[PDB]
Amino acid sequence: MFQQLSARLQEAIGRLRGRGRITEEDLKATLREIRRALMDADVNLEVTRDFVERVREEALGKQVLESLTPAEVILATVYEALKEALGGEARLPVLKDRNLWFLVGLQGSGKTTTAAKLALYYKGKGRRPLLVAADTQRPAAREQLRLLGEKVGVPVLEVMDGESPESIRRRVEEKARLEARDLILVDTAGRLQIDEPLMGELARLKEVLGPDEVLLVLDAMTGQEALSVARAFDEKVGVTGLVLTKLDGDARGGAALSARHVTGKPIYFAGVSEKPEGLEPFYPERLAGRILGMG
Numbered sequence: 001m002f003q004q005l006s007a008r009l010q011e012a013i014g015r016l017r018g019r020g021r022i023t024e025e026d027l028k029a030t031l032r033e034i035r036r037a038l039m040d041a042d043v044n045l046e047v048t049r050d051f052v053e054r055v056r057e058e059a060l061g062k063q064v065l066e067s068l069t070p071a072e073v074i075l076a077t078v079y080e081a082l083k084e085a086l087g088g089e090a091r092l093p094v095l096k097d098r099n100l101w102f103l104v105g106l107q108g109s110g111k112t113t114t115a116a117k118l119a120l121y122y123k124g125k126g127r128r129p130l131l132v133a134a135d136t137q138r139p140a141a142r143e144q145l146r147l148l149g150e151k152v153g154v155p156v157l158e159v160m161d162g163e164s165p166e167s168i169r170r171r172v173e174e175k176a177r178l179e180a181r182d183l184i185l186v187d188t189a190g191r192l193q194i195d196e197p198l199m200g201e202l203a204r205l206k207e208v209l210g211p212d213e214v215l216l217v218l219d220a221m222t223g224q225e226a227l228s229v230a231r232a233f234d235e236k237v238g239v240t241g242l243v244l245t246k247l248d249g250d251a252r253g254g255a256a257l258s259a260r261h262v263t264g265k266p267i268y269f270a271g272v273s274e275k276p277e278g279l280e281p282f283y284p285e286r287l288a289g290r291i292l293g294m295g
């Protein structure tokens with residue numbers, strides 16, 4: 001992901017390198033090339049404009065028009081902007097004594113496999129996870145998580161068809177008690193498109209279970225519709241953090257890049273492969289460095 005954008009940003013910066021001091025017109029041309037490139041990666045006009053303005057301001061503050069190496073000033077400011085556009089420092093959910101997190105999103109987003117990968121990740125960090133297959137309408141969706149839980153060595157409770165949220169609560173509580181589970185990961189129903197009633201039932205499930213986190217899983221190979229999925233889930237259910245899956249895929253990446261800005265929710269993890277350990281904590285500073293060719 002981001003290959004084309006990466007190449008283009010590195011080219012724009014490299015074009016300045018070794019040619020000494022630049023003029024204001026030269027700087028304008030470079031900022032244009034950056035803003036346009038972002039565009040061509042399908043970043044929305046606002047994220048592009050704001051990003052380039054940030055860079056212009058910070059570069060001018062660093063006396064880019066006095067520098068004999070403006071390329072390095074532009075590199076540093078694009079890096080620092082790009083790192084904060086993605087979240088700044090790395091964040092992860094606050095682990096307290098007994099946690100309950102929803103995973104929400106579309107079918108095909110990576111949501112169900114992410115639930116199992118999270119369980120594995122946190123089991124390795126000493127937590128005691130429980131997976132909950134919460135689709136009350138589609139047994140096949142629950143069976144998928146059951147198998148994945150088996151794969152990662154984490155117990156799975158399956159809800160029953162049509163089970164009330166109160167009953168789900170009661171059964172999850174019981175199992176968590178008996179098995180000393182301290183991280184409960186609820187894989188909620190996924191559909192290929194936003195399903196309004198589901199969204200109603202999901203909001204209700206949230207009222208009854210009271211999750212500490214609601215993690216929206218988005219496929220980073222998709223476009224701006226990912227952020228309108230994000231708005232729909234956030235308005236109606238209320239979301240606390242993002243997981244971006246399939247960062248290993250080929251795609252423009254503009255919607256993924258902006259997700260942190262459009263949604264105002266931290267990216268906690270990113271999926272980087274189809275393997276059980278393809279999941280890892282998201283580090284803005286690391287993705288920014290990659291995109292700019294710094295390893």
Ligand SMILES: Nc1nc2c(ncn2[C@@H]2O[C@H](COP(=O)(O)OP(=O)(O)O)[C@@H](O)[C@H]2O)c(=O)[nH]1
Nearest residue numbers: 107108109110111112113245246271272273274
């Ligand atoms: N390469 C790669 N594939 C992924 C990743 N996350 C999910 N997948 C694949 O995405 C597809 C859909 O995932 P699944 O968990 O079934 O999605 P769900 O329908 O939202 O629950 C499956 O083929 C997964 O193996 C990822 O981070 N990298």
